[PDB]
Design a protein around this nucleic acid. Structure first.
Ligand SMILES: [Mn+2]
Lengths: 612, 161
DNA sequence: ACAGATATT
């Protein structure tokens, strides 16, 4: 009489968090056949009949996409055959966890399956894989009825009930195919190119033996950024510019230093003239004094990109190391989900509770207590994206229970959160304008008024200047030694990891979880070297690769091609464009490009012959 | 008509040779001052003119220039910007103007915002200086109170990057 | 020997 019901979530954590809410405490501990999931039961009614609920999880992405076993061997397949003549199959990821058979044996009831997975394209892919696995074993539909349903949510606290009753839609195959198309394109576009490059360079140059030359839609443009900065650094000529600097004596020995209104003069005789109009004159008047209140604006909510940038710049940690530490912290439960691009706080967020948790640490105790007593400012409005909340602390931590890089990242996360909650910095910018002849100079100083987030991030502080004199216009300050300083333009330095991550985000190359992987890949393939302040200096291999790519059909390195392919994939997902047509079109276009590359490789060969 | 035309051009501030005026003279023997002004302004100055500036104008020991004077711009460079950029807003725009009278050359510095001479001004553009104008360390000083830009048009500046 | 992207607990 009772009708069986099936439900699937993405991780057993969500399984607990959803069953405990939709079951009102009536749960079960029924560890599954795989040994890594859980099955939960309940009694309910969705269609006017007693239905026995069942709810489990498929941990992680279920099935991956890879070539058949015949074409994986490098010495038996021509690389071009990987474009259109190579079949591709969906293997089961981590086969030791028998997920497909687990789903098949758990699926025996009809009239209900819903999908409490992530609400993104990855979630659509996973859900359609689950449906593919589960339909052939489920009970047959009796006449006309709907068996497959989908639930959409951004939070799992109280929206779950309304999703359970009202918001019961269907999955979207059009968007679920965009990720499949991306996987197929990326696998076929790589693999073939890297196999050709590896088998070519490992048989022609001795020093490249047992080395891997890799091409990809995200790795190669990443290397190209560093190589173009290398081109700029070695294609720059220093230029001499003269800056005229004069100092005045305010009261006794204050020695106020001024800077010229015209910041530089790229000529010798002109600078000498401007000195000759100023050197022999002994007094200095003042024309304008301005005191203005300005605000240094508080930081936004933390996201993965800015966390990685700060870890690279200030903390001194690589992107992959920072991501691993963040994942470890999330696993232990100290912080929230660490891969999120959401600089905005949800409306129903316990900001006061999160700040009150951090009220017993001898580094933030006074600030947090004062903030809770006085009041908390609303956080800055940011760019919401719906992919999980921003990184925030979730539990009190101390040096003893975690130390090293873990604590060094937790400190920054907590301080960023407190700064986001705290007030705004205010400083007086005092500018004084002197006249030392037919020439104008200025002097600027900053004086803090109310240190806000500065109190919790003592590296965004306003530097302490020794204040400026209160001049009332018409003064007659004596001058000192008006000197013409000689300077050279400084060449740009190599890309820092923060700058590279910014370029990735701007050009759309990589995602929130693949940026550290791409950077580590270009570091470990002996393409770039990390030097000094996390500067990615390109190596000879990177220079020769990117320069040869520029000589040979230079559009396989520019960042715009990945954006164009992503626009095509979005057109696939929305529904305006088809799937097979665009798949074949892109595959044939890049097959033509690869056929050009194979017979044009002599340019890269002769560009490598100068090196090893 | 030659004498009155010469006097009129002298008053107007153009110093052109008799042969230059005759070349600028149209087909009729009757010459209109505005017409010859327009025709001469359209032409390159190096062909038509007379010695105005002192022979040591580019050595500094002059310090003064008097009376009206028409000059032709040849090269304009933004001194306050690097040669690579030439359009950076990190400095107030200071222009070095290579001015010619057809026989010698002088160099002038902007020294103040003009809003009439810009980096896009084509070579051959003609400028009139009125009243006493200052020369220091062999450089003319071009404030806005004496430089009047007469809209010129000459076929130079064909190639620009 | 590969793409990219994600990764229970
Ligand atoms: Mn996921």
């Amino acid at each position: 009489v009772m009708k069986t019901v099936l439900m699937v979530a993405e991780k057993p954590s969500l399984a607990q968090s959803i069953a405990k809410i939709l079951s009102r405490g009536s749960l079960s501990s029924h560890k599954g056949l795989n040994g890594a999931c859980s099955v939960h039961e309940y009694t309910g009614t969705f269609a006017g009949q007693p239905v026995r609920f069942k709810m489990t999880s498929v941990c992680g992405h279920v099935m991956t996409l890879d070539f058949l076993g015949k074409y994986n061997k490098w010495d038996k397949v021509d690389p071009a055959e990987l474009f259109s003549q190579a079949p591709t199959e969906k293997k089961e990821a981590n086969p030791k966890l028998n997920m497909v058979k687990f789903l098949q044996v758990e699926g025996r009831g009809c009239d209900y399956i819903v999908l409490w997975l992530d609400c993104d394209k990855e979630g659509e892919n996973i859900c359609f894989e689950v449906l593919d696995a589960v339909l052939p074993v489920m009970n047959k539909a009796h006449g006309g009825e709907k068996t497959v349903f989908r639930a959409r949510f951004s939070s799992i606290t109280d929206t779950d009930i309304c999703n359970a009753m009202a918001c019961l839609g269907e999955p979207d195959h059009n968007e679920a195919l965009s990720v499949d198309a991306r996987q197929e394109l990326d696998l076929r576009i790589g693999c073939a190119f890297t196999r050709f490059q590896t088998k070519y360079f490992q048989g022609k140059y001795g020093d490249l033996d047992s080395s891997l030359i890799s091409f990809g839609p995200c790795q190669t443009p990443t290397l190209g950024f560093c190589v173009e900065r290398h081109d700029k650094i070695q294609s720059f000529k220093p230029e001499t510019y003269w800056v005229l600097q004069a100092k005045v004596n305010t009261d006794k020995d204050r020695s106020l230093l001024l800077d010229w209104d015209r910041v530089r003069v790229f000529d010798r005789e002109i600078a000498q003239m401007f000195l000759n109009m100023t050197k022999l004159e002994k007094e200095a008047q003042v024309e304008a004094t301005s005191r203005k209140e300005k605000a240094k604006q508080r930081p936004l909510a933390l996201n993965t990109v800015e966390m990685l940038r700060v870890a690279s710049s200030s903390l001194g940690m690589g992107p992959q190391h920072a991501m691993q530490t963040a994942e470890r912290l999330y696993t232990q439960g100290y912080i929230s989900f660490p891969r999120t691009e959401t600089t905005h706080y949800p409306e129903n967020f316990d900001l006061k509770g999160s700040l009150r948790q951090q009220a017993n640490h001898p580094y933030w105790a006074d600030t947090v207590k004062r903030l809770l007593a006085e009041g908390i400012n609303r956080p800055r409005k940011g760019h919401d994206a719906g992919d999980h909340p921003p990184i925030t602390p979730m539990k009190s931590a101390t040096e003893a229970e975690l130390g090293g890089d873990a604590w060094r990242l937790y400190e920054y996360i907590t301080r960023h959160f407190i700064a986001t909650v705290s007030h705004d910095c205010k400083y007086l910018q005092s500018t004084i304008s002197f006249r030392i002849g037919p020439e104008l100079f200025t002097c600027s100083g900053k004086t803090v008024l109310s240190p806000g987030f500065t109190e919790v991030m003592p590296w965004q502080s306003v530097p302490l200047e020794e204040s400026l004199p209160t001049c009332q216009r018409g003064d007659a300050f004596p001058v000192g030694e008006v000197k013409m300083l000689e300077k050279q333009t400084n060449p740009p330095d190599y890309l820092t990891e923060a700058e590279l991550i910014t370029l990735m985000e701007k050009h759309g190359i990589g995602t929130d979880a693949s940026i550290p992987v791409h950077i580590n890949n270009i570091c470990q393939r002996n393409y770039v070297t990390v030097e000094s302040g996390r500067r990615l200096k390109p190596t000879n291999l990177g220079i020769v690769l990117v320069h040869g790519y520029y000589k040979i059909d230079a559009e396989l390195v520019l960042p715009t091609i990945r954006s164009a392919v992503e626009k095509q994939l979005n057109l696939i997902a929305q529904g305006k464009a088809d799937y097979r047509q665009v798949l074949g079109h892109t595959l044939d276009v890049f097959k033509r490009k690869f056929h050009y590359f194979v017979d044009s490789i002599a340019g890269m060969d002769e560009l490598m012959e100068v090196s090893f | 008509m030659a004498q009155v035309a010469g006097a009129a051009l002298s008053q107007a501030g153009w110093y052109l040779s008799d042969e230059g005026i005759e070349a600028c003279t149209s087909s009729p023997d009757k010459v209109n001052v505005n017409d010859i002004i327009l025709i001469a302004l359209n032409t390159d100055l190096r062909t038509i003119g007379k010695k105005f500036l002192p022979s040591d104008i580019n050595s500094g020991k002059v310090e003064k220039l008097e009376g009206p004077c028409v000059l032709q711009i040849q090269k304009i460079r933004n001194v306050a910007a690097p040669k690579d950029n030439e359009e950076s807003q990190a400095a107030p725009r200071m222009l070095r103007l290579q001015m010619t009278d057809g026989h010698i050359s002088c160099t002038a510095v902007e020294f103040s915002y003009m809003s009439k001479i810009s980096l896009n001004t084509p070579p051959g553009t003609k400028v009139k200086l009125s009243g006493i104008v200052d020369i220091k360390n062999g450089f003319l000083l071009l404030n806005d109170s004496n430089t009047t830009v007469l809209g010129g048009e000459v076929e130079h500046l064909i190639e620009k990057w």
